[model samples]
Target: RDLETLSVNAIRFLAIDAVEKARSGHPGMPMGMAPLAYLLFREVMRHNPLDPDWPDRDRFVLSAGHGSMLLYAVLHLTGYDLPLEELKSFRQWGSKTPGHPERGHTPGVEVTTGPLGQGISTAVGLALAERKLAAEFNRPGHVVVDHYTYVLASDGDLMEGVSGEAASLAGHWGLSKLIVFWDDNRISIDGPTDLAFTEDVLARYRAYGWQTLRVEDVNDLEALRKAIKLAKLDERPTLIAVRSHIGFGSPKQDSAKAHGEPLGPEAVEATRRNLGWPYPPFVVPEEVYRHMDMREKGRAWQEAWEKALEAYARAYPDLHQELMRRLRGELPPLPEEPPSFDKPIATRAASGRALNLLAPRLPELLGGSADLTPSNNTKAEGMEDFSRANPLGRYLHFGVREHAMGAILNGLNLHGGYRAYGGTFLVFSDYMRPAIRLAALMGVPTVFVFTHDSIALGEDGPTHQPVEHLMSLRAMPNLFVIRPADAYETFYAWLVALRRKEGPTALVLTRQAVPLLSPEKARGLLRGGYVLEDVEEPQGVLVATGSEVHLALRAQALLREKGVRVRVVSLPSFELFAAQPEAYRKEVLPPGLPVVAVEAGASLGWERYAHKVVALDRFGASAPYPEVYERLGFTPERVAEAFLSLV
Candidate 1:
């Protein structure tokens, strides 16, 4: 008990000293919540610092990530790759410790956080993955894939709508292994949260079918321990509300002044005296380090899990092999030939076909739409809904929670053994951008299917049309925005998204049926952009993407009749094209030749590639798609004339 107390104080002081040195960061959360984290990392969680990627280890997310030092301190003391020097250089350039916990960057950080609601919401996916895998792989006599997903969330995290959306699903899906510790500090950056966010939060969780508990004082270690023990008894997800004081032992204790910035020198000394911590700044007693070091215990845990896996492998070789493959994120060889589409069909429809073909072969390929399954065409044939009753199901019905769907997809991907994806209308991607951004930042190869990619989904008018969504998505760094030219290219888009292991992909699809183009040339989609058709000494290049690539071809034909020659180039992904060698790009759209870009989305950013851009900057009207295209100046005649008029 005395050693545990010392470790908790060490966590608090590390956060305080780190923030003070950086002259920035939120220290109050770590100070108040140190004891809760100490117990979880030291005793409650089954984890090994020696192997952060141990397949069966419990997953922990610090949703209150501004207090990142809390995780860094615990990670260092627990024998994670983080060292005392790295913690000293917290928030400094090139340090393992950043302002926030980053998943790929930190050894034990499960998911990137600091976007208030994302971490907890994503944890739901982790819990879901555990449930799904356990159901699929665990045999009657031998059990594997059993693990809990834990979260340390703040008042701000729960206050975020995305958390509510995700929590609702966690409860509905009966993710009993998902446990959340709510840091009920009752304080916001502006002041006490009661000044605004007032409601019986626990009552709401209960209503959502969660098992709820309350620890009135976070410092009451026994109470906190008992709450965790009681949480395991429920068949539903658990939410524990621990009332914590902000800046617990400082002069600014329980006040808003302790919320973010470091405590001043006098205040720091006063707090040091108040807490009776005699150590110098950044000092941790040897007892704490020796007590918290989990390397040996972690090694044992992983070794045991590996032994179980080996036994399971001998007993059920096939299932074990599949599990190992999924865990490694390995893909089977690509289909020898790309899929063919001769008739006209929407890219979304083609995406559905490709998904169905890939789904049966790859068990890890999991996807669904957020309440738009029919419209988004994300669900494949025979894909059952993932429910409490059907953990073997491959599809998710995220229920109008677009933000939650995005965050959950990340969770499923981050949890390993699943290549997760989700769908929503392109316009509604705004709802999911925060999660999408994090996925890219973490470099998770999760697919985002954004159908109805432009104004051509006409009858819905401006309310549903994604006039600017295309360019907006392209602007995100590390995100591949792939707008397939036709059904053939659409299938290739799915292939690229599936194969990517280093970044997120947005598969922008058309709702309207597009005339299928050449299957032979469709392989060009792999290069991100390629010349589909060319003429000797072409006077101009017609560059476009998605359905508009067909428009460019038709205009090319029209221009030919009018005695003008132009090449047709399909630019499916700006990020990918930019990554290509300059010579290849120049060959596709050579310099000194005027290039005219055509797309139904915003005209911004086209200037980089095209001499002129034929795009819609305004919203569309409710009408048949043909009329909308004709009236909006998207006809082949209009494009031909624009090209003819071009200098």
Candidate 2:
């Protein structure tokens, strides 16, 4: 009891000192749930600090990311790469830790979990990845993929409806390896969760078919371990209801006062003395390190597991080969190009065609859509849907779960070796944005296939058309937003996505037919933007993207008739274009010529390329395509006038 109390106080002290020094971060949860954080990371959790990315290491996600100091302290003392100095630098510009447990920024953080409920849902996905990878790669004795996915959720996490949705899916999918630690401190930044989140969370999870375990008090370490053990044994996902105080060692423990602001130095010192934390800040005693490392015992465990894996590989050569290949991210050979349709085909249609073309070459390519496969053209004709009925099937029916689909794709990418992609209506990207952001942060090469790139989804109306979506997505740091203008560009889009292999790709397609432009002229699509059409002594250049390329072409022809020679540049992938040589870019978009850019979405981010942009600065109307185009001033005449304005 005394040792546990000391450890809990140590976490609280670290959290207070870290946040205080950084002059930023919420310290309330760390102070409140210090005991739970202690019991989980120092006592109950299985982690090898020597290898944070170890395939079989149990995952710990701080879903209630506002309590990030709790995680930072635990990670520092538990041999994660974050040293005590790094914790002191918490929220600093170059610190290993940020205000949040950013995925790539920290070594041990399983997911970037600042947004409430996302970490828990993403943990569910991580657990799902463990299950799937185990099913695929683990031999009976090896058990190389065995691991638990643990999440520490707060009042805000349960309050967010997305967590409930993800938890429901986790339970429905029977994620036995998933364990959620609910730090039931009962208060939020907005005050008591009971004021708004009055529903019984344990009962709620029980209704979702999850096993709920309760620890009567936050100080009960033995009880917490027992609950954790039970959760691991359960045939279903488990939720532990641990009644804890947010910032447990703070002077204002159990009160909402410590929920956000740091515990000032006087209160922090008093709390440390109260909990018998004798050491100074960042001073972890050697005994604590030795005890936590479990070095001798851990080494024996590691050797035993390694021997078992060696034996298993000798017995299961084929499975071993497959596992080795996937771990190395080696794909099967590319298939010869498939025959194309003779008739006019939608870019969505061509996307499906490309999938079939690439499928044979890349056997590890896996994914499908969120109940929109037919509309999204995600299913390649006769590909088998991945289901419990057939584990080997490549296609996955994400059902009506866009959010889950996104999280699952992240999981698939995390497990590695699969060129995982998922399709949904362009409108649904909003539902998937958080996960997509995580995918980018985690550097998971998850291809998000969004069809109906523009208002051309005629009958679906303004609600289905994405106005702000494109710009919103492009704003993310490492996401590759590729809106190809035609079938040829679509092929190249996929090629570039596969080649990049470092970031997530948003491959947007059209619902309406987009004719294959002259690919020779459109080779600039590979550079993210190139002149698709050029005039002899052109007076102007029209930069276009997606379906607007055809409109630019028509405008170019009309301008030529008026004795105004013009160039048409199909600028599809902005991310790619920014990566190209500036000289090549200036060659295509010469500095002297006035440029007019056109697109069916937000005109933001066009200033660099165009003097004037003929783009959707606002939402489109729900009307016939022609009527909407006329109302939105996107017709050839309006664009021509806009071009003249630039002149």
The TM-scores of all predictions, comma-separated, are 0.99, 0.92
lDDT of 1 by residue, 408-515 (tens): 999999898998899999999999999999999999888999999877887888899888888888888889999998888988888888888899999999899989
Per-model clash counts, in order, read 0, 11
Clashes of 1: 0
* Candidate 2 lDDT, 1-647, residue by residue in tens: 65566666677778888888876788877876777777776666666666666555677888988888888887776667777778878888888888888877888878887878778877766776667677667755577767788888887888776788778778777789889988887776677777788887889999998999999886767888789889888888999888877666667776777777767788778877777777887776776666555344444556666676677789997777777677677765654333355555678888888887887666567768988988888887557765444556678777787887887777777765566888998889999788898888878888999998888777678888888888888889999999888877787777777767788999999988866766455455678988887878878899998888888988888777777888998888888888889898898899898999888888888887899998887776677765676677777877787888767
Which parts of model 1 are misplaced by more than 4 Å? none
Per lDDT, the best of the predicted structures is 1
Worst 10 residues of 2 by lDDT: 335-344
Which pairs of residues collide in candidate 1? none
